[PDB]
Ligand binder design. Structure first.
Ligand code: 89W
Ligand code: ZN
Length: 140
């Protein structure tokens, strides 16, 4: 589990979004496994605006932070999961690391801020849903 709180936005894995997220929807993309909802309180997360391919992510299933190299956001075939069927996920970054389904929502961060959230795993890889292209997250 986990979310990004930036301004009056909450960024979650679309597959973990709650009744309140859907009732307060701003933007969602199934192909990206991303949902953004509106919040009463103001978040302090800052979104990275960069093409960093190094960062640190939090892995709940290890209670550990791991420094990783990750691929630039791309269209990647993702096998069926306890939560989606086999399909091309967009804006996905891959790293060598540990990721179980409950690791989704763990933050990948670089020195510029939040890069993305765990979305995929298996076969010794962790996939992060990129948020750095969502410029509108830094305003309104
Ligand atoms: O959110 C972060 N991790 C903390 C770890 C303890 C509780 N879960 C959040 C995070 C991600 C990347 C780098 C640094 C921190
Ligand atoms: Zn960066």
């Amino acid at each position: 589990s986990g979310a990004i709180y930036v301004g009056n936005y909450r960024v979650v894995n679309r597959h973990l979004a709650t009744h309140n997220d859907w009732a307060n929807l701003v933007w969602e993309d199934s192909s990206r496994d991303l949902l953004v909802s509106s919040t009463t309180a103001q978040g302090c997360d800052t979104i990275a605006r960069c093409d960093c391919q190094t960062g640190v992510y939090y892995c709940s299933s290890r209670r550990k932070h791991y420094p990783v190299s990750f691929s630039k956001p791309s269209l990647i075939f993702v096998e069926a999961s306890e939560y989606y069927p086999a399909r091309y996920q967009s804006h996905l970054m891959l790293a060598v690391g540990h990721s179980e389904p409950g690791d989704c929502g763990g933050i990948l961060r670089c020195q510029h801020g939040v890069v993305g959230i765990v979305s995929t795993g298996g076969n010794g890889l962790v996939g992060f849903a990129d948020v750095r292209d969502l410029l509108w997250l830094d305003e309104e």
